Amino acid sequence: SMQDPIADMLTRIRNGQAANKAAVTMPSSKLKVAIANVLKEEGFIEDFKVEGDTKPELELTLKYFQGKAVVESIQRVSRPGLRIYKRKDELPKVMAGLGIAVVSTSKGVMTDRAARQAGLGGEIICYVA
Amino acid sequence: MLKAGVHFGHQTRYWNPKMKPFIFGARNKVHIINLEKTVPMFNEALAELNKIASRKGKILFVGTKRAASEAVKDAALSCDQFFVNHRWLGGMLTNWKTVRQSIKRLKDLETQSQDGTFDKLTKKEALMRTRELEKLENSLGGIKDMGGLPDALFVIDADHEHIAIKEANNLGIPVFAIVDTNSDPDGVDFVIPGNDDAIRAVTLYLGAVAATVREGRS
Amino acid sequence: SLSTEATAKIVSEFGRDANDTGSTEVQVALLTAQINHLQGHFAEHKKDHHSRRGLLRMVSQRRKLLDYLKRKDVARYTQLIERLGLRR
RNA sequence: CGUAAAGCGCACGCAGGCGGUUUGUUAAGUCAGAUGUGAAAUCCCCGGGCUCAACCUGGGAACUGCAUCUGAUACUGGCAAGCUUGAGUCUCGUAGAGGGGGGUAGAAUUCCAGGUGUAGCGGUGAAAUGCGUAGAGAUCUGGAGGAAUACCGGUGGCGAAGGCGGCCCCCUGGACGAAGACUGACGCUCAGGUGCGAAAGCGUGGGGAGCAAACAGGAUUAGAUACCCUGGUAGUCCACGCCGUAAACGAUGUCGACUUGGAGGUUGUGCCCUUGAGGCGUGGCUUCCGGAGCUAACGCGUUAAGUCGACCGCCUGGGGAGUA
RNA sequence: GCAUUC
């Protein structure tokens, strides 16, 4: 059964990018939208939309640069079987800051840089380069 | 411009999934190319070919199938460009220096025939050695005076001439090809979707480039 | 498995009406009826192992539904087992 | 952890681990700040003093911890109310060697009785043992009994695996499709545990045609406790219990999601319909070849050995040894 | 048909 919907969202993005698919659609949720918003702001995904009310469907518009996938790599960090929490000083940085890590803080979901600036730790969601 | 023919493709059995974007539909079980998409890319091909032609670059025509073997030669006579009408020898470009001596042998064979030094009583000089001239000519006939690597590659079939594409990609030479529904893209910098074996299809193709090259050459 | 007439009787007896078939009471009652009916079958055919595997699925399925109902509402669960005379 | 050591033979399942989606609430986990404590030395940083150094020494940092207090509420958990897409129930159908019980049919082998009939039959590379003038073999008639179901039959079908082929009946499990309705997370996995589990084997009682370990004879050979030949007991069959092992193999654990294609088989279903041993769609299972990717390579390749998540099993050089 | 060993 599906037990980690977030990993499914990341897997769809990774598989879609490798398949050169224009967009990927999946069931929508508030956490998925929050993660998608961070990706859109950082420029990893062109845009995202939510269609439907009873069963909303989240669609992500992938983007490519020079014919290669923008998202070089994306991996789940915190998992249902092993969840990871980091303090303010322990926040990791991906590829020496070139990448970002999506952190679920008390103030919401934001990148590692944003969480570090706000001085708030939280659960590490994933690394995307 | 857009006109009759060329749109016809091959059976859906042998279609290449990489070519899904350039197929307009499956008519009568055989895919037909999207002409509205071909004209933009095609017009870009002539424009690029004209640009290099204005740079005095050397264009190479690659046609091996019997249906177009003579057609390429006709274009090579309408314009001063080079061509290959028969089997593409493996390595015509990767080891061109190795093929240079083969060209020189053909020149010597051509010379001996012109001034009549070959008219010796022995059949060895008269028959056996002169039979090599047409053997070499039919394969190196259009490449004799190239004197170097071509500045661009023109191919009638991207799959039947896959060897030629690989050599051009290795040497970085730009590749223009009449890529068919079943052919493999991604090996050609400029792709011209359409039929590759229809007589009325190719003649328009090599005829078109044979013209724009002349204006570019000036 | 179970006759349509018998199935309809159970649905109207335990469910809200003749169309409410998904209720936990209906599902548990239907499984209980088949389990009790199959008791005679396995009394004579003792080594019908292949069919017995299907019976054990009904027993396991009934237990899962009964536990869910007990968690959701204890009062309804207690009444159901009393009516069906099970959980011994 | 396909083949190098490594996926339990296969399942059901308690404890345990994990868990779709929405709102509110709680603030346990988590996070922020402060407070107390975390001895000194030591380690580390900036200095000072022994001619330098070792050494000694001032201050700081550190002691990643624990406890309290005050806050934050995104995520996880608790509680309450929900929702339908996971899962499940109901209605109408379809296919199948799925399982258990009973009955029955035909071909054939062997045996028994009788007729016709006469010197061979049988067997091997060759031969012999063997059978036969006490009438064999062959051929015809009738009877008895046992076991298995030719053709159909097909990288066809069904089952969790093992496995399951004549036909008919009785009892019975699961799967799949069509729309519609209902329940509303009831789910996934599973240590221990429990159930099933080829063949051979064991116990008791039957049955025993064929086949055939052991055994006997005849050959072969330097020898032949074998291969070959002629015989032949257990066993193979049934009833009930036990054994619990296989190269029990896809040498590939279960569940869910995602990722270019092509040609077939099998079983439902929608639609166009006069221009049918037709045309276009949509499900389940299944065989083959191949793209990206993956792999030490071989190869795998939407039924993954690709890209991910949950849980369990298992491996750590060979031999000794799966042995004491 | 049988036909071992270094």
Ligand SMILES: [Mg+2]
């Ligand atoms: Mg081995």
Ligand SMILES: [Mg+2]
């Ligand atoms: Mg092994």
Ligand SMILES: [Mg+2]
């Ligand atoms: Mg949740």
Ligand SMILES: [Mg+2]
């Ligand atoms: Mg707290």
Ligand SMILES: [Mg+2]
């Ligand atoms: Mg101290």
Ligand SMILES: [Mg+2]
């Ligand atoms: Mg000093």
Ligand SMILES: [Mg+2]
């Ligand atoms: Mg909650």
Ligand SMILES: [Mg+2]
């Ligand atoms: Mg176990």
Ligand SMILES: [Mg+2]
């Ligand atoms: Mg046995």
Ligand SMILES: [Mg+2]
């Ligand atoms: Mg016995």
Ligand SMILES: [Mg+2]
């Ligand atoms: Mg006995």
Ligand SMILES: [Mg+2]
């Ligand atoms: Mg024998």
Ligand SMILES: [Mg+2]
């Ligand atoms: Mg074993």
Ligand SMILES: [Mg+2]
């Ligand atoms: Mg087997």
Ligand SMILES: [Mg+2]
């Ligand atoms: Mg194994």
Ligand SMILES: [Mg+2]
């Ligand atoms: Mg297995």
